[PDB]
Design an enzyme around this catalytic site. Structure first.
Site, PDB file in Angstrom:
ATOM      1  N   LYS A 120       0.853  -1.179   0.000  1.00  8.40           N
ATOM      2  CA  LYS A 120       0.000   0.000   0.000  1.00  8.40           C
ATOM      3  C   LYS A 120       0.892   1.232   0.000  1.00  8.40           C
ATOM      4  CE  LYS A 120      -2.283   1.597   3.582  1.00  8.40           C
ATOM      5  NZ  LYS A 120      -3.228   1.591   4.732  1.00  8.40           N
TER       6      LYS A 120
ATOM      7  N   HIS B 196     -13.176  10.066  12.328  1.00  6.22           N
ATOM      8  CA  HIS B 196     -13.758   9.419  11.155  1.00  6.22           C
ATOM      9  C   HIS B 196     -13.817   7.906  11.328  1.00  6.22           C
ATOM     10  CE1 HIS B 196     -13.094   7.467   7.118  1.00  6.22           C
ATOM     11  NE2 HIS B 196     -14.236   8.097   6.907  1.00  6.22           N
TER      12      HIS B 196
ATOM     13  N   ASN C  97     -14.556  11.981  24.093  1.00  2.00           N
ATOM     14  CA  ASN C  97     -13.790  12.592  23.022  1.00  2.00           C
ATOM     15  C   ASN C  97     -13.116  13.853  23.547  1.00  2.00           C
ATOM     16  OD1 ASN C  97     -12.992  12.391  20.223  1.00  2.00           O
ATOM     17  ND2 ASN C  97     -14.239  14.212  19.817  1.00  2.00           N
TER      18      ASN C  97
ATOM     19  N   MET D 238      -5.663   1.766  19.169  1.00  2.00           N
ATOM     20  CA  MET D 238      -5.489   1.811  17.726  1.00  2.00           C
ATOM     21  C   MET D 238      -4.963   3.141  17.206  1.00  2.00           C
ATOM     22  SD  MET D 238      -6.593  -1.258  17.235  1.00  2.00           S
ATOM     23  CE  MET D 238      -6.515  -1.266  15.445  1.00  2.00           C
ATOM     24  N   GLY D 239      -4.918   4.182  18.034  1.00  2.00           N
ATOM     25  CA  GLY D 239      -4.578   5.511  17.562  1.00  2.00           C
ATOM     26  C   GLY D 239      -3.100   5.769  17.346  1.00  2.00           C
ATOM     27  N   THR D 240      -2.255   5.277  18.248  1.00  2.00           N
ATOM     28  CA  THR D 240      -0.827   5.581  18.208  1.00  2.00           C
ATOM     29  C   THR D 240      -0.152   4.726  17.144  1.00  2.00           C
ATOM     30  OG1 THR D 240      -0.831   6.185  20.550  1.00  2.00           O
ATOM     31  CG2 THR D 240       1.294   5.682  19.530  1.00  2.00           C
ATOM     32  N   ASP D 241       0.233   5.356  16.030  1.00  2.00           N
ATOM     33  CA  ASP D 241       0.951   4.684  14.954  1.00  2.00           C
ATOM     34  C   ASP D 241       2.161   5.491  14.496  1.00  2.00           C
ATOM     35  OD1 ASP D 241      -0.430   6.752  13.816  1.00  2.00           O
ATOM     36  OD2 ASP D 241      -1.280   5.585  12.163  1.00  2.00           O
TER      37      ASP D 241
ATOM     38  N   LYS E 181       3.241   9.987  19.278  1.00  2.00           N
ATOM     39  CA  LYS E 181       1.844   9.898  19.670  1.00  2.00           C
ATOM     40  C   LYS E 181       1.700   9.084  20.950  1.00  2.00           C
ATOM     41  CE  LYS E 181      -0.271  10.379  15.083  1.00  2.00           C
ATOM     42  NZ  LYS E 181      -1.041   9.688  14.011  1.00  2.00           N
TER      43      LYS E 181
ATOM     44  N   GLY F 140      -2.521  -1.920  18.281  1.00  3.69           N
ATOM     45  CA  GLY F 140      -2.728  -1.921  16.846  1.00  3.69           C
ATOM     46  C   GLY F 140      -1.994  -0.801  16.140  1.00  3.69           C
TER      47      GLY F 140
HETATM   48  N1  NAD Z   1      -3.518   1.682  14.088  1.00  2.46           N
HETATM   49  C1  NAD Z   1      -4.015   1.630  12.808  1.00  2.46           C
HETATM   50  O1  NAD Z   1      -4.016   0.588  12.162  1.00  2.46           O
HETATM   51  C2  NAD Z   1      -4.553   2.906  12.250  1.00  2.46           C
HETATM   52  C3  NAD Z   1      -5.106   3.040  10.976  1.00  2.46           C
HETATM   53  C4  NAD Z   1      -5.579   4.277  10.557  1.00  2.46           C
HETATM   54  C5  NAD Z   1      -5.500   5.384  11.410  1.00  2.46           C
HETATM   55  N2  NAD Z   1      -4.953   5.218  12.653  1.00  2.46           N
HETATM   56  C6  NAD Z   1      -4.833   6.372  13.631  1.00  2.46           C
HETATM   57  O2  NAD Z   1      -6.115   6.656  14.095  1.00  2.46           O
HETATM   58  C7  NAD Z   1      -6.051   8.006  14.604  1.00  2.46           C
HETATM   59  C8  NAD Z   1      -7.312   8.726  14.197  1.00  2.46           C
HETATM   60  O3  NAD Z   1      -7.690   8.266  12.972  1.00  2.46           O
HETATM   61  P1  NAD Z   1      -8.864   9.442  12.328  1.00  2.46           P
HETATM   62  O4  NAD Z   1      -8.330   9.473  10.941  1.00  2.46           O
HETATM   63  O5  NAD Z   1     -10.128   8.824  12.872  1.00  2.46           O
HETATM   64  O6  NAD Z   1      -8.375  10.861  12.843  1.00  2.46           O
HETATM   65  P2  NAD Z   1      -9.519  11.993  12.918  1.00  2.46           P
HETATM   66  O7  NAD Z   1      -8.613  13.192  12.971  1.00  2.46           O
HETATM   67  O8  NAD Z   1     -10.789  11.753  12.167  1.00  2.46           O
HETATM   68  O9  NAD Z   1     -10.109  12.071  14.548  1.00  2.46           O
HETATM   69  C9  NAD Z   1      -9.037  12.381  15.349  1.00  2.46           C
HETATM   70  C10 NAD Z   1      -9.492  12.377  16.785  1.00  2.46           C
HETATM   71  O10 NAD Z   1      -8.352  12.525  17.610  1.00  2.46           O
HETATM   72  C11 NAD Z   1      -8.678  13.393  18.693  1.00  2.46           C
HETATM   73  N3  NAD Z   1      -7.665  14.453  18.683  1.00  2.46           N
HETATM   74  C12 NAD Z   1      -7.300  15.352  17.663  1.00  2.46           C
HETATM   75  N4  NAD Z   1      -6.322  16.180  18.030  1.00  2.46           N
HETATM   76  C13 NAD Z   1      -6.025  15.809  19.354  1.00  2.46           C
HETATM   77  C14 NAD Z   1      -5.087  16.297  20.302  1.00  2.46           C
HETATM   78  N5  NAD Z   1      -4.261  17.327  19.962  1.00  2.46           N
HETATM   79  N6  NAD Z   1      -5.009  15.737  21.553  1.00  2.46           N
HETATM   80  C15 NAD Z   1      -5.875  14.708  21.817  1.00  2.46           C
HETATM   81  N7  NAD Z   1      -6.810  14.139  21.024  1.00  2.46           N
HETATM   82  C16 NAD Z   1      -6.856  14.729  19.780  1.00  2.46           C
HETATM   83  C17 NAD Z   1     -10.124  13.974  18.423  1.00  2.46           C
HETATM   84  O11 NAD Z   1     -11.006  13.293  19.252  1.00  2.46           O
HETATM   85  C18 NAD Z   1     -10.341  13.635  16.944  1.00  2.46           C
HETATM   86  O12 NAD Z   1     -11.641  13.224  16.671  1.00  2.46           O
HETATM   87  C19 NAD Z   1      -4.869   8.712  13.876  1.00  2.46           C
HETATM   88  O13 NAD Z   1      -3.917   8.952  14.851  1.00  2.46           O
HETATM   89  C20 NAD Z   1      -4.397   7.647  12.869  1.00  2.46           C
HETATM   90  O14 NAD Z   1      -3.018   7.555  12.743  1.00  2.46           O
HETATM   91  C21 NAD Z   1      -4.480   4.015  13.090  1.00  2.46           C
END
Ligand code: NAD
Ligand code: NAD
Ligand code: TB
Ligand code: TB
Lengths: 322, 322
Positions: free
Chosen positions: B69, B139, B161, B221-224, B228, B293
Site C-alpha cells: 500500500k 472518522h 472525546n 489503535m490511535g498511536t501509529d 503519539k 494496533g
Molecule cells: N492503528 C491503525 O491501524 C490505524 C489506521 C488508521 C488510522 N490510525 C490512527 O487513528 C487516529 C485517528 O484516525 P482518524 O483518521 O479517525 O483521525 P480523525 O482526525 O478523524 O479524529 C481524530 C481524533 O483525535 C482526537 N484528537 C485530535 N487532536 C487531538 C489532540 N491534539 N489531543 C488529543 N486528542 C486529539 C479527536 O477526538 C479527533 O476526533 C490517527 O492517529 C491515525 O493515525 C491508526
C-alpha cells in the site's frame, strides 16, 4: 477522478533517446541542488520462485514527481514465457496524494540506464572523443550504444565481450547507427577507446589498470549489487570519480572494492549532477574519469513522468477510474 | 495478460465488516505461523505540503498475495476538497512478478483497522463484556464501533472525546446498531467499559492507570507514529500486551513510551496472532489486556485481495492492459 495507465507495448513508440536524456539530465541536476532525493530502498527475497521483490521510491520537488518503481527479478519466468525482470512504476500527485499514473518499467529501466551513461559522456568525455569502447554485448548494450551516439558524434566503435558468441549484437547496433565496428581484445580497447561503456554482470575486474592509456572516460554501468565488479581497483584509484548516489556507489557500486581497500576516499566520490548544475568543474585536468552508475528510483520516476506526457499527447494513455 | 483496477467507489458495495474480519483474522494467524511477513516500512516526510508518504509491503506465502500500500497523510488536503488520508494498494503476481491489481485504499484502511480491533476483541475481551467504551469520535471511530458490535454482542456504548462536539458521530452509529449511547468522562469509562477502543491522534496520555478498574480489554489503535500517545505508561506496564508487529509496537506503537521509560521490555510484548493460531492462551487471568494496533501492510493486502475477488464476481473490476 481518473488515473492514467501506459501499457508496456507503447513505451517503444513513445520514448526516444532525446526524451530519455532530457529527463535524466534534469533529475541529476535536481539531486545535486538537493531538490530531489531517493527513499530508502526495500529489497526482499520473498522465498517463493526465488524472487527478489522491492520498491524504489523518491520525490522530485523540482519537477513535482512522486512515486516508486515496484517489482524485481523472477529467475524462473521462462516457464511463463516472461522475462526475468518485471517492474512497474506508480506515480502519485504530490499535492493531494492520489495515484496519478501506472507505467510498465521494463523498457523504461533500460532507457534511463542508457540515458544516465549518456549524460556522463556529455559532461565528462575527453575533447574530441574519437572511438567509443563497449565492454559487454548483452540486452542493455544496444540501448547504451544508441544513447551514446545520440549525445556524442563518434568515428569508430570498438567492442569486447566476455562471451564472444554474442559479439554480433554490437556490430548490428553500430551498423544501425551508421558507424564502423571492430571486435577488439580488452588490452587494445583501453588504449584506443576515448569513451568506454561497460555493461556486464561481472564478478571480477575486466578492464585492467594497464589497459587504459591516454584521456578516457569510463561509464561503469554493470555493477549494481554487492559483489559485482568490472574494473581493476587500481584503475578506479587513478581516476576522478562521479556517481548518482554516493551512498550506493561505495556499497553496491563499482567503488565498493576501492573504498574497502582504502584505495580511494569517500569524500572524493563526486556527483555527476553537480557537474550538470555547474557546481563541479567536471573532468578538469584528470586523465581518466569514471561514472559509477548504480541506478536510483528518481531516474525511473523521471522517464515515467515523461512517457505519460508523451502518451496522452499521442492518445495512448488509458484513462482509468479509481 | 492485463491488470485489474477496483475504483474506490466500489469498495463499499463489495466489503462487509464480516468479510474484512475473516481476512484480517486469517492474516494474524499466518503471521504467527510465519507463513507471512511485512516488509520494512518506508515512511518519508517529503517536505511538500507537509505530507507523509511511504510504502507498506508484505508477502503472504499461504494465500500467495504480494504487493504494498502506497500513500500517506496530507495535512492540508481540505483545500483540495479531499480527506487527509490517501492510500492505494497494488497487488503483484507472486509467480511472475507482474502487477495484477490496483485498489483504492482509503475505505480499505478504515475497514481493516476496525477488523484488527475486532479480532483482538474476539480473542481477548473479558467473558460476557456488556459495555463498550469508545475513546475518540473521529472518522474511523464509526468503523471501529460497527466492527466491534458485529463480533461481540454489547448492551451499551459509552464514549468520550477530547472535542465533545464530535460525540454525535458515536451516538448516530450506536443508533444504527440498536445500542444505547451515553457520553461520559474518562473516570467512568475506565471503570464501566469492559472493552475499550481508542482511536485518537493524541500526544498526551488520556486513559490513566487508575481509571481502568476491573476486567478490561483495551484496543489501542490511535498511536501509529513516534511521538503519539493515548494511554498512561503505568497502565501499559500492568497489562498483558499484544500487538500485530512487535518491532513497530515498541517504536511507533503505544508501547513506545513504556519501553523508553524502562517499565517494560520488548520480550514482554506478545502477538495477537499467536492467540488466533492457538499458540497463546491470551487473556487467562489477567485483569487488563491491551492490543497495540499499529497497522501492517498485510492487513491492507488481505482486505484488497478479497475485494478483487468480489469485484471480478460482481463485474466491477476494470481490465486494463499494461
Ligand atoms: N492503528 C491503525 O491501524 C490505524 C489506521 C488508521 C488510522 N490510525 C490512527 O487513528 C487516529 C485517528 O484516525 P482518524 O483518521 O479517525 O483521525 P480523525 O482526525 O478523524 O479524529 C481524530 C481524533 O483525535 C482526537 N484528537 C485530535 N487532536 C487531538 C489532540 N491534539 N489531543 C488529543 N486528542 C486529539 C479527536 O477526538 C479527533 O476526533 C490517527 O492517529 C491515525 O493515525 C491508526
Ligand atoms: N546501473 C544500472 O542502473 C543498471 C540498470 C540495469 C542493469 N544494470 C546491470 O547491467 C548488467 C548487465 O545488464 P544485462 O541485462 O545487459 O545482462 P545480460 O546478462 O544481458 O549481459 C550479460 C553480460 O555480462 C557478461 N557476463 C555474464 N556472466 C559473466 C561472468 N561470470 N563474468 C564476467 N562477465 C560475465 C556477459 O558476457 C554479457 O556481456 C547487470 O549486471 C545489471 O545489473 C545496471
Ligand atoms: Tb507547513
Ligand atoms: Tb461546531
Amino acid at each position: 477522478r481518473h488515473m492514467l495507465v501506459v501499457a508496456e507495448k507503447e513505451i517503444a513508440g513513445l520514448m526516444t533517446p532525446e526524451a530519455a536524456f532530457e529527463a535524466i539530465e534534469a533529475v541529476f541536476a535536481s539531486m545535486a541542488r538537493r531538490k530531489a532525493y531517493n527513499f530508502p530502498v526495500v529489497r526482499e527475497a520473498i522465498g517463493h520462485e526465488d524472487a527478489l521483490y522491492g520498491f524504489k521510491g523518491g520525490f522530485d520537488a523540482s519537477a513535482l514527481v512522486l512515486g516508486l518503481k515496484a517489482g524485481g527479478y523472477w529467475p524462473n519466468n521462462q516457464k511463463h514465457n516472461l522475462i526475468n525482470h518485471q517492474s512497474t512504476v506508480f506515480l502519485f500527485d504530490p499535492d493531494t496524494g492520489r495515484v496519478s499514473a501506472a507505467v510498465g518499467g521494463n523498457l523504461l529501466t533500460a532507457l534511463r540506464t542508457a540515458a544516465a551513461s549518456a549524460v556522463s559522456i556529455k559532461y565528462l568525455a575527453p575533447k574530441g572523443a574519437k572511438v567509443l569502447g563497449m565492454i559487454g554485448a548483452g540486452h542493455q548494450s544496444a540501448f547504451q550504444m544508441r544513447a551514446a551516439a545520440n549525445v556524442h558524434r563518434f568515428e569508430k566503435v570498438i567492442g569486447w565481450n566476455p562471451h564472444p558468441e554474442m559479439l554480433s549484437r554490437l556490430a548490428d547496433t553500430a551498423a544501425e547507427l551508421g558507424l564502423p565496428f571492430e571486435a577488439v581484445e580488452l588490452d587494445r580497447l583501453g588504449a584506443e577507446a576515448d569513451v568506454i561503456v561497460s555493461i556486464t554482470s561481472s564478478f571480477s575486474p575486466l578492464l585492467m589498470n594497464e589497459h587504459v592509456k591516454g584521456p578516457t572516460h569510463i561509464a561503469a554501468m554493470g555493477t549494481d549489487t554487492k559483489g559485482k565488479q568490472e574494473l581493476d581497483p587500481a584503475l578506479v584509484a587513478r581516476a576522478r570519480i562521479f556517481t548518482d548516489e554516493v551512498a550506493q556507489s561505495v556499497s553496491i557500486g563499482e567503488c565498493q572494492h576501492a573504498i574497502a581497500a582504502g584505495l580511494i576516499r569517500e569524500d572524493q566520490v563526486g556527483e555527476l549532477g553537480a557537474v550538470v548544475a555547474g557546481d563541479d568543474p567536471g573532468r578538469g585536468d584528470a586523465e581518466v574519469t569514471i561514472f559509477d552508475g548504480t541506478g536510483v528510483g528518481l531516474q525511473d520516476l523521471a522517464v515515467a513522468q515523461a512517457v505519460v506526457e508523451l502518451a496522452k499527447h499521442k492518445g495512448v494513455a488509458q484513462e482509468v477510474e479509481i
